[PDB]
Design a binder for this molecule. Sequence first.
Ligand SMILES: CCCCCCCC/C=C/CCCCCCCC(=O)OC[C@H](O)CO
Ligand SMILES: CCCCCCCC/C=C/CCCCCCCC(=O)O
Ligand SMILES: CCCCCCCC/C=C/CCCCCCCC(=O)O
Ligand code: NA
Ligand code: NA
Ligand code: NA
Lengths: 221, 222, 224
Amino acid sequence: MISILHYGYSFIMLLGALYFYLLSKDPKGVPASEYLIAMVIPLWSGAAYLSIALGQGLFQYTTIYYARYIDWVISTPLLLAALALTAMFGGKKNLTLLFSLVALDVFMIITGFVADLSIGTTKYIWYSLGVIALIIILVITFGPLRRIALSNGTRLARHYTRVAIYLSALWVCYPTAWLLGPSGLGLAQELTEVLVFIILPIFSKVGFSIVDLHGLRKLHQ
Amino acid sequence: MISILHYGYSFIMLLGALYFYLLSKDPKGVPASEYLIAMVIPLWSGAAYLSIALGQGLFQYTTIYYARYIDWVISTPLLLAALALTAMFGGKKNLTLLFSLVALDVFMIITGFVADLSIGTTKYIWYSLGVIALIIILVITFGPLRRIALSNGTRLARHYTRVAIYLSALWVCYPTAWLLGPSGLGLAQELTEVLVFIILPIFSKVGFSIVDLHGLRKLHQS
Amino acid sequence: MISILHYGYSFIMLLGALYFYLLSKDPKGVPASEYLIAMVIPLWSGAAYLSIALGQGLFQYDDTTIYYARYIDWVISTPLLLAALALTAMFGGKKNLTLLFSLVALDVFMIITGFVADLSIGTTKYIWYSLGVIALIIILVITFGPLRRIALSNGTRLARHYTRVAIYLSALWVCYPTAWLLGPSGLGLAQELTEVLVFIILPIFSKVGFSIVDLHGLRKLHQS
Ligand SMILES: CCCCCCCC/C=C/CCCCCCCC(=O)OC[C@H](O)CO
Ligand SMILES: CCCCCCCC/C=C/CCCCCCCC(=O)O
Ligand SMILES: CCCCCCCC/C=C/CCCCCCCC(=O)O
Ligand code: NA
Ligand code: NA
Ligand code: NA
């Protein structure tokens, strides 16, 4: 079942990527960069999850699905880039703020991998550092990055706020599931965690970009 | 023999690098970025192949020359950057298209490495995904990237087209040799593959940049 | 003792990061990019050294202990330090990102050769070490040659500050391959504990000290 779920995931990622490609051909004032980011996220995630489907992207240690970290270390910084460029749409870019989010995010995913390879107090030190990185990402998202969105007018700021809440709601689920599941306290069963880390990312990767791109395209007319 | 061939390769990479450095000192209207890229490619490849020469960049699994993938994951994106900047010479840059090629290319090399670590059907799934990435790179090369080159005038577009054909002809040999050799069907012997992955990259890395830089330098007024 | 020294280091990195964050809030004409670089360096190093303190960022190999977390640190922190140095030289003028990325490429290569040298035995070890030393020499040639000429093109006051920071960095950086060669990774003349203290104290000056001096000099160029 776990294999088939991962094949299904990879197929949905492929369909999302093709959809973003088709949108890219009639862009409606959205720059090519935002379509490229929207395509890379699902294609990379699809490849990583394909490796799990084939029985390759995991080892016994508990089962570490290390292919999830290979996925997230690329897909999650690109999602924050997508979010930052939404805030900056129609105005001057702040690439310093964007790379701040990328750095916090890459650190966050690495702490998750290290936490998974750790035992006891050490595991929760790494987990805690990752949670602190996420909190700072959310502070940037609803603080300075939202103020950039407000500077780009009512309609953009409304769209940004919707996508920021969408992303934030989904992202806080990941460390929650991780702590509850086999990598953490072991309250939730492996199969439950597998379904959560199939369904969440479908919304985090394809859903997010459908909402993000549709809202930006609508600003054209 | 395999060790000595890799020492030879690394020496040729060093000579290429020094040649590009000397050209960089009298640049003839070619930006410093294109000289930097031309130098990094052979120096990085030379270091990776030095590790094989020293008996370090390989393990038994059949022999996986993993240092080739360490080489290509850096050298091949830089070659496509060189190709993209050639198309954009004298005009506005399209870094979105450039990073599209980089992303496709890094994926391509990773699928190769995973294919090498895989057995049976799994191996050919990864190989096929890599080949699909290469096809998209070639579609971009002869489609949108070539239209950028045409927008920069007859002489630039003529040079771009020659370099694009040069690169494309060499690059399709890599997945061909891979499939024929020990990582794939195992029709070609290890030593045969070693010579192919010595001679191809000499043309792919030093040859390519000699041709690319010479054509760009020739566009120079005064 | 080794564990406690690493906890201490990580705490000092955290304090440096906080100081640079506070400076960033009253920037005095220094772009946000230079404050971000100044913060990432110590935070990343602090994380890497935290892993050593927890007993994780090290393994036994050739009977010696390889502190592999040091290379994970340096491969990110050292290119960012040269970026900080290059942006100092370019302060008030046109950026040369080609020269900046030249330093980044040399530097990443340098750290990788160090790691490979540490995993190597005999002549092979010293081939890798030598390639890293050649990379450092070229970095220092760029630092005092073309990069210094960019700094001089940005006027007396900037060039004076650049030269001070270039000497500061260069003096500290030549110590790393010197300690490496003397210590357990090289000739084994210096003891593990001695090397540990050197690779605690040097980086405190290389990462926090450097950026205090660098940022203070740039901030002082500001009028208000
Ligand atoms: C194993 C492989 C590891 C790979 C290692 C990766 C190295 C990470 C650092 C990169 C250099 C950072 C470069 C900084 C970019 C230039 C900044 C710039 O342009 O600044 C503009 C201005 O200052 C704003 O106002
Ligand atoms: C593990 C794989 C990591 C791959 C990293 C990528 C390798 C480095 C190549 C980057 C592409 C270079 C792009 C240069 C842009 C030049 C644009 C300009 O000159 O304005
Ligand atoms: C592992 C070693 C390789 C690491 C990356 C090396 C980067 C090589 C390519 C960089 C090209 C950057 C050129 C930027 C051009 C901008 C124009 C300028 O200001 O000079
Ligand atoms: Na966006
Ligand atoms: Na070129
Ligand atoms: Na600086």
